[model samples]
Target chain A: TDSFWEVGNYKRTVKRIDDGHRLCNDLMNCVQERAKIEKAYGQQLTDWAKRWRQLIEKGPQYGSLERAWGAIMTEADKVSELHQEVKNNLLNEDLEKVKNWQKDAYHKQIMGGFKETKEAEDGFRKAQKPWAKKMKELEAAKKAYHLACKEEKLAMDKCKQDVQKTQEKYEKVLEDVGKTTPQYMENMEQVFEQCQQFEEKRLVFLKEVLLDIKRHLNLAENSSYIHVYRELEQAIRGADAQEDLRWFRSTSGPGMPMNWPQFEEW
Target chain B: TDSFWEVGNYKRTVKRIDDGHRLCNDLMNCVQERAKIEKAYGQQLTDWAKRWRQLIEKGPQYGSLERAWGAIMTEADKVSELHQEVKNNLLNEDLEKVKNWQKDAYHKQIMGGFKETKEAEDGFRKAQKPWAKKMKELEAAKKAYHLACKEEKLAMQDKVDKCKQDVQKTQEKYEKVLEDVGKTTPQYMENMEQVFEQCQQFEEKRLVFLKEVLLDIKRHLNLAENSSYIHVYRELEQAIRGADAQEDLRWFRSTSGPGMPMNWPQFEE
Candidate 1:
């Protein structure tokens, strides 16, 4: 029944650098997607604004944005009243004015149809504008947040330099010892062992970063921005804890930073 | 069967620009192929010189180019005599020296091997050098001949132009009179027939140039410079003359230049 994943003994090792990288990638994706949406939304708003202006220029006498949209109801009432008035006012002598009458009637027909069409278009745009602007603001906020996360990730890159410096120091120490005392090499044996451990932890950290990034991308894809934000927050928190090199070990580590080896260990 | 070929009738009909173009192209090809060979030979010599230097530096008496190659045969013969003398003078007391005799014998063995190898290489190089140089000189001569032919062709081109202009002028004059009279409402029809004719002739001239140019290239490829100067001289003369345009074609005769059909030909003549 004993296996590599046995909780009491050898448990699964966690990678912190990878976790950090994942945060960086997910944060970048969020900013990138937000910027994309912001661009699309801006284009939509620009088109809506142009349509709004055209409606205005086509005139207030043609019915305003509100009333024109209220027309499928108004058109029936207006047409019935106009037809009754025309029937009552029909004088035989006015047949001479019938040509002028017909012209006026035709214009009324044009105005009525245009009135409703322009109103409906304008009203729909007016309704959507506030929502579009809100989305744009959200997108910008997301963009700024993602950029800040990038900077945070870049700040964490110093950990890599720390790892490299420690690794190279051990390597140089081992190389020097090899020339002087081939068998009784001080730091040569232990440095290789410890440097290998450090390199493994570096890989683990990078993998953790990827895992967190995947989790966030998954959250973002589900239309749950708040859950994505929570995942992102957790990724950053993990990143903060990861940079404290002592904690770079198995997750079930009696949960503590292991002590560095002394000179005798070499 | 001596058929009288009227050169005068054929003279007017012959395309002079095409003829000049053909000669120039043949000469150009002779030169262009010669150029490729000249360049290849130069590269080969340069590479050989480099390889020679490398061999000298690495050879047994590796120091100077002159010392490595020169006086080698003479030195080898003298060493052969010395080696015989040393072998004859060998004694029981000189057993150690005889056993390690190669300390003195090294140069003789090395030099003898070097002589045979270098002589073989030298023979090969000696045979190849003149042919390489011929490639170089032939290319240079061909370039010179090409320049001469090019100038002759261009000058002939001018004669061709003058004849075309005369034909155009007479043809245009004949066309204008009738064309102007035909149109009460003339949508100005300019005669483009001569331009079209020139375009057609240019293509024909290009074909003639391509044909001779390729033939000259084929002839140059077969020629080798191994034989005596006169022997190569005869070969070169034949290759060059076989690809030669006739001497009469080279002349810049104003009347023999390219001509177009004139509108008014006095038919009674």
Candidate 2:
């Protein structure tokens, strides 16, 4: 054990060499296992992360009560429009076919007998009128329902969009606080994780606010947080507004901060 | 507008199908776009998730703070180990060389002058003691430092593994509550995307609890909920859980009818 590496030993230099060899072996073995474990764990984390994100991206698209009833109604309006167009096409085709059928029946009846003419005429008139009437009622009901639904959908869409826009505008004011990204989100999560540290309702409220932002953007074309993200990017860029935006999106310009900045501020 | 299929002269048949189709198209478009956004966000999320899990797994292996500092700590540990082994092998060879050098120096002097040999011998003596001592000190110090660093590295590794186990165990309790397979995490994200009228905070709390459980699993793995990514996953997950678990989280399971009051708020982060 006291291979030449023993503090003051001199004669057994070869012994020390052996000690060094053993020490090196132990060190290598230790780290190798560690590296292996780290890599493996990293794989697990990445795998889970992949699954988690996939779920987010490819997951459910609808049916949440959190959305306002108005938004749901707006959805109905859209359905109404589509329904009307399709129904109209199908019904028109049916009506034309029925009219042709009645004409053929009338011609056939003329060659056959007066009784056939009278019965065919009555049947044609009866059939055409009821068919047209029933179809009209169906269209009218659908049109009315959809009209109301669409108006409500538009209203709901507007309300949600407006709330999102408002939140972004206010959030921009606090952009310097750098509270919009995952870091801030993480911090809040940490606080929330400590069940004893935060009241149940308080943590729940923070989660709700986040969901609300997501709801607005989820249904809308534009990202609800994009505006706020842009505002923060502008502050980050100092004088270069467009360039900063490009940088963040990876479109044109140098990418993210290479080194951590001391303070994220103007 | 009512040119065709206009029942009556007006229109009303539950053209509900038409409405359904239109709404379906809108929903499809919205989802497609959402999928794109999530795609961008998901890549980052997945990458970070993998990193997070690795940190958890490796935390237990490294024994000390320096070992677990960052990505480089692991590399540094490797180099140090290599240097120690090579130095030890070279030391044995060098010691033999020292003996040969000392003997040659002594013989060369002996042939040149007897008077000079005494002085030469004295010189060798002086060099011998200190040079050997110095080499010994260097060797001992290198080995000692290497061992200490290695031990620290092992600690860090152990911590990471423990963290993973802890989180995994905690998640087990709520396995039933998780989104069913492909359905679970996305439902959370979907609900997060849509108005989250269904979820409650209890489920969100459960996710946080799972994280803590993982933290507890790897006691040494200091996956501070405060850590950058460690935070996001928890927050996002909680947001989803909060929406659905609201009834359970808010009312504390009263015997009162299914009409649980809407006391729970929305997910914020």
Candidate 3:
């Protein structure tokens, strides 16, 4: 029963470890997706900034647009850089550390312990099987011997000898089972303690990295990017001079060379 | 006096031709300047369009933003392409044609005629110079020969013969000048007419090209004026509100992991 309980305990630990690993993996993947989105967003910011510069150069005499959009562009650049840093840390350091801990601490050490403990239990059970069979054999031999004596007939010396040898063999096997059982259970207990310690550390690491991702997301959310579009709208809409000039061009009758050659008194 | 007036007429014609050439150059330069401005504006339009696309792809999702901003971007693209086309036509074909016309018809033919006419005026003046000098000599010779005859000198016939020869040579020189002046003046007049016609055509072409540039500017101006920036702002404002929630990364993270180890629910795809 102790051995059975040990097997179940090891199995439950494995399941817990698997569940935690999967959770870590999902969180890691989600961070990866966030990183991709951040990168694209960064590129867009840079592009928008460049567009403002071009507009300023082209014709729009909006110094306000320039200063506002220029600052926004710089902010976008900084945000993009921060996103890249977060992505790199998540992939290279945070996730890698978790995987490495899982492999070395849980996969290698705890799983090895479970395997050895399971083997020990099986070894004990195997030894007990023949020992138990020999115990039955010994009982039959003793009964045969007793019956012969009662009936006033001579019991075979072989029968008496068979009972003594069987008893000795069963005792030797029982001794082995007894020695292996305690050692196996003790090994399993140690492994369970180590697994518990590993899980605690792994969970802490997972939470720490999740917090790191949360910080990045907060930075993204707090970046006054919404103001940029708003300011852009103002800058573009307030460009009255540009609009007026465009209006003039649009309705200003015919293009150049406006009916020239005024053959006058030249 | 007629000859003097004819020379003045040729000079005036030369001046007129020069004025027209200068005007043509001015008009050409103006068109060239317009082309440059259009090209720069086109590039700006393209940049603006690309900027809008990048913004759309990045986020701030509003269907209205897409429709409004997308139309503006498309308009910019179309306007920019049209400007480029205008620029190419002005620089390559329109301006080039005007320049060629100026060179072949005005500068070469008209100026060439003026040069020849100017030379004829100078030639007539030179020929008249010697003829007048010779005539003065003959006048003195005849007076001396008449005085010799009045004094009953026997060498008076020889003086008369010398005066006669002088008059003949001077008359021939004067006749040639008259003939060349008449021919050159008429030819110069004809060339001036041709030059005037070419200049008129060149002016028409120049005006036409200028009109084209003005039309392009009008298009650019219309595009700038009609840019639905207000609509863009509205759409973006709505999108920004939506994005405010989307950007709530903390909320999203909470959805993933609520509390401690037990708090992390199973992530379903």
Candidate 4:
């Protein structure tokens, strides 16, 4: 049940590994692309904040509302900076780690195939080669033994002495094969031993890449991102319309603390 | 001292009322322009969300993180919807109401010059007319008394006696004007009082509506009134917190798509 040692498993393992590497590489590219998306979004937020930052000033807004309005843009600028910081952090810290891992994990072969694939196949095949030659010898020995047993009847019609000689040769060869069976088994172990090593590394690397991709994209989970939004929310909350109106009443409104029309007897 | 009774105060009150309307229209236009700013920002949100909506799907994102990423787009769309709603609502509700209030506050158009101030101006003149007539007549009578008294000093006895009659008649008329003016004063005062109070009424209503519109501006900006919009950001915050990077990786591990075990070759007996 342990496919880890399976010699035939290497063939399929190599196939699946190649296929999986494509997705692995695809995911690496995707995550970094995701980071740039982060960058793009930050750029958009900065531009968005820029337009309003000036608008609120030249605008008709006044007093407490004006102060709150300005603060909103101020926080928006900070929000944009946080996003920009995250974009770079992900690119440098998270994405950079994976790319470095990629360089170590895979270097491509001359064709589209890579060093990892070639190494996996080449390592397995070398071990498989010795085991395969023994299987041929074992088959040949078995075939010879059966042939001699069959030739005994035919040779009896031709000559009894020749039949006796063939049986002796067959018995000695069967004995040699029995003596070499342990060697045959040893080479089989070598084949699967190679399989286990390569396959284990493949699975482990798969896990590492997933973990790499996972941690890299957790930009939203960070406190730095959260705080920017918290500040913005505070700014939004601080807009006191009633307060602004009260100030407006004193400053520009008709009820200014100024003299109003009073009865002056002429 | 309710300046509502002051005749001279009408001048400045009308001036301020007119100046206040100029600012009022400025504010109204600004609100509508603020609405457009809302529209612009919403447009940016929609555009922002749109780009990510496609990017996340096409990117390497998966499982809980993918769900969280997708949820962000939904909330952003809702946020954009609220902004768009506010933009339209401000223009429809606050902006439209202020414009209508402007018409009621100042019905005069400047074909040649400012309209409502002139109405206030001419209205003030007529309001002052009654007491003013009496005051002018009193001045005329006093002049006549002076002339008659001067001729009295140069008069013959019969002439002096005639001058005395003239002086008495002019003096009586002058006193009569003084007496009548006192009576007319109340009438003049009432007219001026009503004029000032009418002017005060416009200013009062203008201010009340300004507060209403500005409060509404706060309502939209703060995202207080739109319940759906409130839920959108709350949901986004929840999603941001709930997106378990571990869970996403765990699913990948458990699915075992890329890392499943295979059967090892056995040494056959």
The candidate maximizing TM-score is: 4
Task: Write down the worst ten-residue block by lDDT for model 2 chain A.
Answer: A257-266
Arranged by TM-score, best first: 4, 3, 2, 1
What ranking emerges by DockQ with the best candidate at the front? 4, 3, 2, 1
The segments of candidate 1 whose C-alpha lies over 4 angstroms from its true place after superposition are A1-266, B1-8, B11-13, B63-269
How many Å off is the CA of A260 in candidate 1?
99
- Looking at model 3 chain A, report the run of 10 residues with the lowest lDDT sum: A257-266
Which tens-of-lDDT digit does each residue in B17-67 have in candidate 4?
666667667656556665676676577668767776786687554566566
Q: For each candidate, C-alpha RMSD in Å?
A: 53.4, 48.9, 20.2, 10.5
TM-score of each: 0.14, 0.16, 0.29, 0.48
Cα-based lDDT at residue A115, candidate 2 = 41
- For candidate 1, the lDDT comes to 0.31
Q: For residues A12-50, could you state the per-residue lDDT of candidate 3 as single tens digits?
A: 444545555555554455445445544554555455546
User: Least lDDT summed over 10 consecutive residues: which range in candidate 2 chain B?
Assistant: B4-13
lDDT, candidate 3, B35-77, per-residue tens = 6755765676677567655654553322332343244355446
Residue-level lDDT of model 4, residues A1-266, one tens digit each, is 32423335446545544654554565455455555655655565566567766665665545554565456456446655765775676667765665676666667876778777776677666756655555455565556555666776665544455546655655565555556556544654464445445445544554544444434333344565455445555654665555654554444333344342222221
Sort the candidates on lDDT, descending order.
Answer: 4, 3, 2, 1
- Which predicted model would earn the best lDDT? 4
Worst 10 residues of 1 chain A by lDDT: A4-13
lDDT of each: 0.31, 0.32, 0.44, 0.58
Model 4: residues with Cα > 4 Å off, grouped in runs: A1-9, A15-24, A107-115, A134-266, B1-269
Error of 2 at A163 (Å): 99
| Per-residue lDDT of candidate 2, residues A170-253 (tens digit) | 444334333333343343224223321222332243234334322221211233223322332332223332332233223211
Judge the docking of candidate 3 as incorrect, acceptable, medium or high: incorrect
